[PDB]
Amino acid sequence: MATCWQALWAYRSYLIVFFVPILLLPLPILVPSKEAYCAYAIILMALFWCTEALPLAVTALFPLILFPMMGIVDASEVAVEYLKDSNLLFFGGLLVAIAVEHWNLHKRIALRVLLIVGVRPAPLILGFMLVTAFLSMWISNTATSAMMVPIAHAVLDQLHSSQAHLTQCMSLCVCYSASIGGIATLTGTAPNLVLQGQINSLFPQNGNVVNFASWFSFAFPTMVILLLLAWLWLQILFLGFNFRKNFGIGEKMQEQQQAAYCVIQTEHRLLGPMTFAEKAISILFVILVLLWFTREPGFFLGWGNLAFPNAKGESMVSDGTVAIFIGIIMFIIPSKFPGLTQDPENPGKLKAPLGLLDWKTVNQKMPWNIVLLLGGGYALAKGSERSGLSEWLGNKLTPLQSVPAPAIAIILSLLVATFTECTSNVATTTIFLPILASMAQAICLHPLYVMLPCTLATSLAFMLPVATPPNAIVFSFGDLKVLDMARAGFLLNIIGVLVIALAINSWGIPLFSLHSFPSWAQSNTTA
Amino acid sequence: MATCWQALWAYRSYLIVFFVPILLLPLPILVPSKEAYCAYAIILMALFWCTEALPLAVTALFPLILFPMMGIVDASEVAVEYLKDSNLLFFGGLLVAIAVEHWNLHKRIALRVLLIVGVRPAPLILGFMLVTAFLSMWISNTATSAMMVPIAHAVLDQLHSSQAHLTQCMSLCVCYSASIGGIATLTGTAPNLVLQGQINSLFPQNGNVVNFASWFSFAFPTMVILLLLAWLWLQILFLGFNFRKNFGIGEKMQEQQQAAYCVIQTEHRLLGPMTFAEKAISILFVILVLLWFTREPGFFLGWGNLAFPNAKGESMVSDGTVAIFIGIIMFIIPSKFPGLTQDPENPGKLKAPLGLLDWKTVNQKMPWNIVLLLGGGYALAKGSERSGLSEWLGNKLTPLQSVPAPAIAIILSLLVATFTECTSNVATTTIFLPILASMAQAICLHPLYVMLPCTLATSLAFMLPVATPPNAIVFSFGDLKVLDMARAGFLLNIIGVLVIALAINSWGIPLFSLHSFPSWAQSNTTA
Numbered sequence A, B: 001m002a003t004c005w006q007a008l009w010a011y012r013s014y015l016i017v018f019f020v021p022i023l024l025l026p027l028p029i030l031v032p033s034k035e036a037y038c039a040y041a042i043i044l045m046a047l048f049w050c051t052e053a054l055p056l057a058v059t060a061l062f063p064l065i066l067f068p069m070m071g072i073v074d075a076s077e078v079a080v081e082y083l084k085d086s087n088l089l090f091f092g093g094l095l096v097a098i099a100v101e102h103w104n105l106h107k108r109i110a111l112r113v114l115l116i117v118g119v120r121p122a123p124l125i126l127g128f129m130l131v132t133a134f135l136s137m138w139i140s141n142t143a144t145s146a147m148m149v150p151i152a153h154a155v156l157d158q159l160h161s162s163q164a165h166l167t168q169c170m171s172l173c174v175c176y177s178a179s180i181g182g183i184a185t186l187t188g189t190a191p192n193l194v195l196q197g198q199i200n201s202l203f204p205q206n207g208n209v210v211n212f213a214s215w216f217s218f219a220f221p222t223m224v225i226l227l228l229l230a231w232l233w234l235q236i237l238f239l240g241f242n243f244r245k246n247f248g249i250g251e252k253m254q255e256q257q258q259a260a261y262c263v264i265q266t267e268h269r270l271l272g273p274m275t276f277a278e279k280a281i282s283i284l285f286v287i288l289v290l291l292w293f294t295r296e297p298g299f300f301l302g303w304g305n306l307a308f309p310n311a312k313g314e315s316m317v318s319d320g321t322v323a324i325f326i327g328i329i330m331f332i333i334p335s336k337f338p339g340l341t342q343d344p345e346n347p348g349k350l351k352a353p354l355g356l357l358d359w360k361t362v363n364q365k366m367p368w369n370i371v372l373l374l375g376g377g378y379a380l381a382k383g384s385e386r387s388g389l390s391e392w393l394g395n396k397l398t399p400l401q402s403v404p405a406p407a408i409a410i411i412l413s414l415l416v417a418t419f420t421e422c423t424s425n426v427a428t429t430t431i432f433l434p435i436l437a438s439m440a441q442a443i444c445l446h447p448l449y450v451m452l453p454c455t456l457a458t459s460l461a462f463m464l465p466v467a468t469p470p471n472a473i474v475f476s477f478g479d480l481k482v483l484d485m486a487r488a489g490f491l492l493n494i495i496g497v498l499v500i501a502l503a504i505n506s507w508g509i510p511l512f513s514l515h516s517f518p519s520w521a522q523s524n525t526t527a
């Protein structure tokens, strides 16, 4: 009787696997098209992540057994989508983070951070949101998340150990600041450069109206307002809304934080002179970031364009090649260089010191499930283009002409920021942007009024682990749930739409003259 | 004085990394072309595998940092070569081998094999060479090596434990029989079907001279002679040439083998009735092989052509899709199905049984280095086509016309079997075969006399771990060296050439009429 409601709650992860793909079978049966077959696979994988029925890397293997056997794409063509260039940037970025962790260099950094900032929950999070968003303005968002996530994990382990929901608030703040901060520069992310392509290709006489100096004046105050509104929402949701326990003001919080800071000062006064392994890894860490800043900056000419150019003039060497090249070097350098030890067998001959990385410790400490989880996001987005789901949704934005013009920028921002959680940012932008230019010419509206919110809203990807590859790197240590990401990222999409709709109707109107319909957007069909 | 020769022998793995890429710099400097830049990367990676200076998966990351920064191919195009379709067949094939190993089913199979064959070294190896070569005639060579290598490893662990150089002789015999046995049928391997394409496309009036019934009559006696000559060479090299210790004849070998067989009979009489986890995995193992036999057989119509066809008529579902689909199912089925246990925290609610596979045991027992080692072989072969190294070597076979005709089949077989150790079998065959047809028409020679040894010699890949993806699967357990493979595979290439040159000059002459220059190979330029 009452034992039936006990057992079925224990079997809740086996009842979802058996009853979710049956309850969605009205979709690929009643509307038999190739677009409905791709929408079935998107809802299915999004429901297996929130309920956590399967492991995260097992659900990412579902495009390998769905897209062939419903006719979307061949099996050999869906297989080469799983190890792209951004997978190797996560691979080589975590080869450095393993050698930092193994030689106790993460205990040196996490004690030097907490001596500067201090044991306070909320100013420590804002200290990590500012450095991550500042770094993401100049390098790729995957290179920032692969570097800052193992550092933010070592600070939390040194905070909790020295004190005897904060670990989810700090893992999400590095995920979100790497995506929010990338929109303040023209070369910050990838869909920002597509808008400069589609403006110079659609309207060839614009006179360079979208350059580095005018995009920065429009999108940098949007980044700062969206950052401080994301810090307030992440603090209210996961930490309390007390706003005095968070900053630690008053008594009974100054008694603990003096007793927590005096442990950190003692723990830092031990672990004295640095070893040879810490001196060689910290030098290789500065060289790795200095080669990321100056590889292809865009506003001057880096070493990736002087040496190694292609026919067009861009770089054949990406950010992943610099990360693999440094991680290979760590297999070569000895760890204790004059370390002639003795071997137990054949006493005889001597033994060599191990390198800064050996394969035995790389095989243990590597998050191999994230490499598959990131690869399952590309195959889910590639099958969305090969079926025609992006083209079908793009041809539904056209009858939105009979809405007043300030409300076309809001409805379009919601539809792009929802749809970009499934697909890629670069492929959504190059499809939608020719459609919105032809729609703006028909209702005597200026372009870059429906194209500028369409470019900024592809970077508001805050819910699912397949959009914005920063979203999957934060699951490398298993202290999160995918429900906890979707619980914080839903209202952050609606906050981010109301900020973009503020920046396009105030301080976006004078520096672009959005009230004129200028003389480079005419055609033979307008007037 | 004498301590200098002690220390430098200990540092032998750091002196090779520093002095091999300096001693080969005369190649990319003196002959500055794009073909010499690709030959430099091939010799470099082949020298780091034999001397074992770096780990096997680290050397496979070298096309990611070589081919971009010497102009061969872009970094984003060399990155999507590392997870192809045959990587996922090794992945899903080892998901089943982990669940077999974890639930002690490998102890049931390894005791049932040794009760049938018996503790004798040399007839046990021939028992594994026959079943592997028979299975490889009907399915892909990667699916046979992914299934038979964990079974042959469990027999050796049960042989050595029940007895108190054989472990290298048995790992290589499953590697070589999966490649040798695949040439006896037309649909056995991939370059065999390319010859039926290039014959029907070059000479359209051949009258179907290469079909299933005539290829089998020519290439099946070649497979059996090459198999028994490979069993004799592997036994002489690794085991002794005593030929009575191997078969175990005489006294002092019948005293041990009766005392070794009586341990196996006792060890098998324990481990009684099978559990639920052994009954569900053994049924999923028969269904996996039954779906591999009948997917796309070629001589009748499988389920891959009836259901899921493409526009041409072939299958959109490959052997990798069947292996992933079974390995996903093992995450769903419970292991002890009415297993309502108790949880220590909240005594209260109950707990669910784990599946047949959980991610904690997959993350430990998976050979993740072989997935990278197999991917480094495709990127090394793809960069050989994008530079033009295969085209350059193909245009050097043309001036071989002024050699007597039985010696053109031997020289060409040596040059293909050497060059195929670096590149792929399918891409070497589709480049070389149009060149040899045009060379055969100019010296009044029959085709399929220089094309039939060119098709059979792309399957004699026995030295390096990048050719024939069976060659990299045998390193999954680390009991081999790459030098031990190259020490057995060098003379097996010269043995395999002298067998092909026997089958093309005896019993290859009457059933193809190779002495006639028939009426379908004429042109406007011949006579």
Ligand SMILES: CCCCCCCCCCCCCCCCCC(=O)OC[C@H](COP(=O)(O)O)OC(=O)CCCCCCCCCCCCCCCCC
Binding pocket: A108, A109, A112, A113, A116, A117, A127, A128, A131, A151, A282, A283, A285, A286
């Ligand atoms: C404002 C909050 C900032 C929080 C910053 C969090 C992110 C830190 C990223 C660290 C990146 C490290 C790159 C590699 C470094 C290699 C060198 C190395 O390890 O040397 C040993 C060094 C410790 O040397 P030792 O003291 O001799 O043991 O360890 C370090 O990693 C150095 C500390 C790095 C982080 C410092 C961040 C300071 C930001 C200050 C911003 C302004 C604060 C204003 C408010 C306070 C005013 C007083």
Ligand SMILES: CCCCCCCCCCCCCCCCCC(=O)OC[C@H](COP(=O)(O)O)OC(=O)CCCCCCCCCCCCCCCCC
Binding pocket: B108, B109, B112, B113, B116, B117, B127, B128, B131, B151, B282, B283, B285, B286
């Ligand atoms: C000739 C040498 C043959 C050597 C064969 C080596 C390769 C064996 C491949 C085994 C593939 C197993 C697929 C999955 C099986 C699931 C079922 C299962 O495990 O059932 C429990 C079963 C044991 O059941 P139990 O006895 O109740 O514990 O275990 C097995 O896996 C069955 C044994 C499989 C291998 C048998 C090979 C026999 C070949 C005979 C060829 C002719 C020999 C001529 C000379 C001797 C004459 C007397």
Ligand SMILES: CC(C)CCC[C@@H](C)[C@H]1CC[C@H]2[C@@H]3CC=C4C[C@@H](OC(=O)CCC(=O)O)CC[C@]4(C)[C@H]3CC[C@]12C
Binding pocket: A017, A021, A028, A029, A032, A065, A066, A069, A070, A071, B329, B332
């Ligand atoms: C539940 C787990 C353990 C296994 C996988 C179940 C689902 C995730 C997928 C895998 C195979 C899928 C099926 C693969 C192919 C088809 C055929 C498809 O219809 C056609 O292809 C009709 C013919 C055509 O128009 O081409 C309708 C959906 C369906 C049944 C799919 C329904 C959803 C299925 C069962």
Ligand SMILES: CC(C)CCC[C@@H](C)[C@H]1CC[C@H]2[C@@H]3CC=C4C[C@@H](OC(=O)CCC(=O)O)CC[C@]4(C)[C@H]3CC[C@]12C
Binding pocket: A329, A332, B017, B021, B028, B029, B032, B065, B066, B069, B070, B071
């Ligand atoms: C030894 C490990 C620790 C680091 C890597 C060393 C070698 C494996 C590779 C990596 C980079 C390679 C270099 C990359 C580029 C070039 C330029 C190349 O010449 C040109 O490209 C000339 C200009 C042109 O014609 O395009 C000659 C080889 C060289 C020096 C390569 C020599 C071999 C190098 C040093």
Ligand SMILES: CCCCCc1ccc(/C=C/C(=O)Nc2ccccc2C(=O)O)cc1
Binding pocket: A046, A047, A050, A237, A486, A487, A488, A490, A491
């Ligand atoms: C299928 C993919 C989507 C998953 C379903 C889903 C899950 C969560 C949410 C967002 C809930 C939320 O934002 N709730 C709150 C609001 C205001 C204050 C506190 C909360 C709170 O939940 O704590 C939306 C949708």
Ligand SMILES: CCCCCc1ccc(/C=C/C(=O)Nc2ccccc2C(=O)O)cc1
Binding pocket: B046, B047, B050, B237, B486, B487, B488, B490, B491
């Ligand atoms: C750079 C890639 C090639 C590696 C170099 C290389 C390594 C090994 C060999 C083959 C040696 C061999 O076959 N030797 C023997 C012959 C007859 C009986 C016993 C042996 C024996 O070595 O035990 C050839 C070349």
